[PDB]
Design a protein around this nucleic acid. Structure first.
Ligand SMILES: Nc1nc2cc[nH]c2c(=O)[nH]1
Ligand SMILES: [Zn+2]
Ligand SMILES: [Zn+2]
Lengths: 390, 382
RNA sequence: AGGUCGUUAGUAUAGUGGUGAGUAUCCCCGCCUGUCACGCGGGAGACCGGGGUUCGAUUCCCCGACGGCCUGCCA
């Protein structure tokens, strides 16, 4: 029983446009999903977020299993009841803590041992335990624990990680207990090596999984390797199931990768960058602490539609950010989430009515001005698939 | 201005002002509070969440200390301050310094006063003060005064006499300067009364200030330790005897629920509303009841304890705020211990609503004249 | 009127006749890709004015200004 239905597919490139059929309503692909780790979005009530338009949200396993712990969260009727959110949820496997908290833990074939970064206590996280606590949380898409290595390391470490991830995959498949209510997503590993990633694809395509996801591609690395790796991954994967690219969040990346056949995205950039005082716009961003925005009586963006871009001007936000009142950090957050949601919808409608190749030209023109000044890593990716601008 | 007095029983005035604002079309009840703001908005709230609060009053309260820095901008905007901060539908009152952060003593001279802003300390003469008032265009504004004597709690009579004379000079000068101009003529100006802890001064100040066409009065310097709460309560009833009975009375520094019920008894109209902010910033949640008909026992609960970790209940039964409709105590404890921002929002939305409810109830009860029962109910707890 | 005390970044406070004048806040740049994050680095910014004493003056003496306190005058 498939979970994805196709609606419209570009006849010039490989972009798609469809819809997911999840246990709490349905979502139109592509989609961007913001992330709130400790069972909240930072600084903003759920009614605001729901009214902005968003339809699926995130969570984390390590943190929630640490404090407050599985036992009472299960007694609070899962993370839907605990957080009070009537839409779809997606729960991460805690494998990213294996690269973020690198100098605080060790890993063996049995699991991983973590020393808490809030008080130095150590405990064990093995595939069975991770899958169990995720079963207690009760999400709509559940991810398998994998042995993540950094995308900046070499040596036989990558092969060990790949094979160990496969073995853990089979263990956690055997450990899964609610096959009907959750969708386990195999995670493709292999770093940046062609042969290793090909082997991984070939091997773990044979298992029965609802979906597939592409991992190990985040942070700082050459983009020339990045897009080639995504293009390799997309062709081998089947067409009846969604792809999923983890940890890409900027606008240019979203559009290019849509052209290359992705379906879902995740990042923490917009929310976190809001709390440092910066806003997102069709031309980049604004830093509302400089002196240049002190006497500027217009809106943030004339064409926007968020609650912030209709009442308040730039001058007022500048002046309010300089006090101790934190309400000025709950304005930027709303704008950035709205910004992100509108762009995906625009692209989707552009492709449904058979005009997608002309959306891209306009977007590049707006962002960089002359369409001949886009990043050289975007021209190659676009020209490979058929879309030619300039 | 138009004052109504439906009932005056046992020295407890009840009424409503009906002609105020631009030219009318606004009514304000008595007694009441004013919404407390930091540099524009309510603290931790934006307009969307602010309008989820029931029973927000119609007049707010700016502080000259917070807005004095951004002065060269409002002249360029040219159109007032309810339009700059995007609240263009309420009256405004511009007090001088906020009650939460006290002003250290020992800077007032016979030419200017001082106020403590974020960028530091700034002193202002008469001309600067009038220019700022012209630019802001608020409905009301308290005149430039001298109140440095509250800090000492004990001093020679010479300082107190000097203070009273200073304040009189300031009032006269500003009255003339405002009379001269044009734009300022549509804003009301209110008077200030002081004198320390002497009956003579507390009488002379009031007698001498009543003979000017100011539109209302301010009673300054009536807070202190609970060991002097009779010598700081007879003086008040002696003071409110030399003022015309047609203008509002304001009192600064009194916001606890227990002192208010006795400050109203000597005749007082309007109050600040900063106490719920204090009880929120400390991490607690107000829980005393004021329903008379049906911190010792319950005045606030502390939520960083351990007993509130497997507790699935609202903060207060029957509270109608957003927090008490959606979330539970466990979740707020989890938010507090793990150091989250949303905790402030969810607690402010509750504390403000509770306090406003209290003031509405006390006004209604005073209308029905059953203040003794409510006074006993409040006193038996804190 | 007379007597006495005081003056150091935009705004507070330590310090010395031989110190890059210390600290905390403002001001100015940079960083952010499924949260160790209302965060992390870096920079800039002062001894009231005048005269004398001293090898050397923010450090000792004299004058002026500004301000507080006391007395006198006055209420
Ligand atoms: N589990 C998991 N999470 C993330 C988040 C970003 N990258 C990864 C990855 O490779 N694995
Ligand atoms: Zn907007
Ligand atoms: Zn409540």
């Amino acid at each position: 029983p498939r979970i994805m239905r196709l609606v419209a597919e570009c006849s010039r490139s490989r972009a798609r446009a469809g819809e997911l059929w999840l246990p709490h309503g349905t979502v139109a692909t592509p989609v961007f999903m913001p992330v709130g780790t400790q069972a909240t979005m930072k600084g903003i009530t759920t009614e605001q977020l729901d009214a902005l338009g968003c339809r699926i949200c995130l969570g984390n396993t390590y943190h929630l299993g640490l404090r407050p712990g599985p036992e009472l969260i299960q007694k609070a009727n899962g993370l839907h009841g605990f957080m009070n959110w009537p839409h779809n949820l997606l729960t991460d496997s805690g494998g990213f803590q294996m690269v973020s908290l690198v100098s605080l833990s060790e890993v063996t074939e049995e699991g991983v041992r973590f020393r808490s970064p809030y008080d130095g206590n150590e405990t064990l996280l093995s595939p069975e335990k991770s899958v169990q606590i995720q079963n207690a949380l009760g999400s709509d898409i559940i991810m398998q624990l994998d042995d993540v290595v950094s995308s900046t390391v070499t040596g036989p470490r990558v092969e060990e990680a790949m094979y160990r991830s496969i073995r853990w995959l089979d263990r956690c498949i055997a450990a899964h207990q609610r096959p009907d209510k959750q969708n386990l997503f195999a995670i493709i590993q292999g770093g940046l090596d062609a042969d290793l990633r090909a082997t991984c694809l070939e091997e773990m395509t044979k298992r029965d999984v609802p979906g597939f996801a592409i991992g190990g591609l985040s942070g700082g690395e050459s983009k020339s390797q990045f897009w080639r790796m995504v293009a390799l991954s997309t062709s081998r994967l089947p067409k009846d199931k969604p792809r999923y690219l983890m940890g890409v969040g900027y606008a240019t990346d979203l559009v290019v990768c849509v052209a290359l056949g992705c379906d879902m995205f995740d990042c923490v950039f917009p929310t976190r960058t809001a709390r440092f005082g910066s806003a997102l716009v069709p031309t980049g961003n604004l830093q509302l602490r400089k002196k240049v925005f002190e006497k500027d009586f217009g809106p943030i963006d004339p064409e926007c539609t968020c609650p912030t871009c209709q009442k308040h001007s730039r001058a007022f936000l500048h002046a309010l950010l300089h006090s101790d009142n934190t309400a000025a950090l709950h304005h930027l957050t709303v704008h950035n989430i709205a910004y992100q949601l509108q762009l995906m919808s625009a692209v989707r409608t552009s492709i449904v009515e058979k005009r997608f190749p002309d959306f891209v030209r306009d977007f590049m023109g707006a962002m960089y001005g002359d369409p001949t000044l886009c990043p050289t890593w975007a021209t190659d990716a676009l020209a490979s698939v058929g879309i030619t601008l300039g | 201005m138009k004052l109504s007095l439906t009932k005056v029983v046992n020295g407890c005035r009840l009424g409503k002002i009906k002609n105020l604002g631009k030219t009318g079309d606004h009514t304000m009840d008595i007694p009441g509070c004013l919404l407390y703001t930091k540099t524009g908005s309510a603290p931790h709230l934006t307009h969307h969440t602010l309008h989820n609060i029931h029973g927000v009053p119609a007049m707010a309260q700016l502080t000259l200390s917070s807005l004095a820095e951004h002065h060269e901008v409002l002249t360029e905007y040219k159109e007032g301050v309810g339009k700059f901060i995007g609240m263009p539908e309420s009256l405004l009152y511009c007090s001088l310094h906020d009650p939460v952060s006290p002003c250290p003593a020992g800077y007032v001279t016979n030419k200017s006063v001082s106020v403590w802003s974020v960028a530091g300390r700034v002193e202002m003469t008469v001309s600067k003060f009038m220019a700022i008032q012209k630019a802001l265009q608020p409905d009301w504004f308290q005149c430039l005064s001298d109140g440095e004597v509250s800090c000492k709690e004990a001093t020679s009579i010479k300082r107190v006499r000097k203070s009273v004379d200073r304040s009189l000079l300031f009032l006269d000068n500003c009255l003339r300067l405002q009379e001269e101009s044009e734009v300022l003529q549509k804003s009301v100006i209110i008077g200030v009364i002081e004198g320390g802890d002497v009956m003579e001064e507390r009488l002379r100040s009031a007698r001498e200030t009543a003979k000017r066409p100011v539109g209302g009065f301010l009673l300054d310097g009536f807070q202190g330790n609970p060991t002097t709460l009779e010598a700081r309560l007879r003086l008040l009833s002696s003071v409110t005897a030399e003022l015309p009975e047609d203008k509002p009375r304001l009192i600064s520094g009194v916001s606890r629920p227990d002192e208010v019920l006795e400050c109203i008894e000597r005749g007082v109209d309007l109050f600040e509303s900063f106490f719920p902010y204090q009880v929120t910033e400390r991490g607690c949640a107000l829980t005393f009841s004021f329903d008379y008909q049906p911190e010792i026992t319950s005045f606030e609960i502390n939520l960083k304890e351990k007993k509130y970790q497997e507790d699935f209940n609202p903060l207060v039964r029957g509270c109608s705020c957003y927090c008490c409709k959606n979330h539970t105590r466990a979740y707020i404890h989890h938010l507090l211990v793990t150091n989250e921002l949303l905790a402030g929002v969810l607690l402010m939305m509750h504390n403000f609503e509770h306090y406003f409810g209290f003031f509405h109830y006390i006004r209604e009860a005073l209308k029905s004249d059953k203040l003794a029962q409510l006074k006993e109910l409040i006193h038996r707890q804190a």
